[PDB]
Design a protein around this nucleic acid. Structure first.
Length: 114
RNA sequence: GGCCUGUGUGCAGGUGGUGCAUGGCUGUCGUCAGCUCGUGUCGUGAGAUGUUGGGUUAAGUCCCGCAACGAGCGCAACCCUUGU
């Protein structure tokens, strides 16, 4: 089950993946072969985990949680802020701090101070 | 009974020792800019991190990027005198 289709997907560049001096997995199941020393995006895994992410993440999205829009890159500060102003959800701008998400009971106190 | 005369009984007192038994008080490094805690992450552990690195300061005073986020006791300042 696809989402929307190939040519009006293919418009703006589909072949990404980085530099060559850095790859480290082991995964022959996602590694293909050399031409001009660089790879192409993965067909079967795109489709299959598109479907699986769809079904289970809909189940949990019905189970009902929420996520901050923490957006940081200078490429997308205003873009993310615009969509976040549209969707109305809270957001953050600049930096991921070391050690909040575990030590939450004192950013609780930063909230009281806020 | 106030009171003081004695008798002795409880005694009362020490500038006699331990300041290395103690408290209190005080000088000193030093009015030098630092010294710690929370909760966390790291480390088997002693411990580290924060408090490293630049600009910057009378100074851990301040800014910027980061396993740190935060804070206190400090340095500043409301005190006195002088200066209009």
């Amino acid at each position: 089950m696809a989402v929307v289709t190939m040519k009006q997907l293919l418009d703006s560049g589909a072949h990404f993946g980085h530099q060559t001096r850095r790859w480290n997995p082991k995964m022959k199941r996602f590694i293909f072969t050399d031409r001009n020393g660089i790879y192409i995006i993965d067909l079967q895994q795109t489709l299959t985990y598109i479907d699986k992410a769809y079904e289970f993440v809909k189940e949990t999205v019905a189970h009902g949680g929420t996520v901050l829009f923490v957006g940081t890159k200078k490429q997308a500060q205003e873009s993310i802020a615009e969509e976040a102003t549209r969707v109305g959800m809270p957001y953050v701008n600049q930096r991921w701090l070391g050690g909040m998400l575990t030590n939450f009971s004192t950013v609780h106190k930063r909230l009281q101070r806020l």
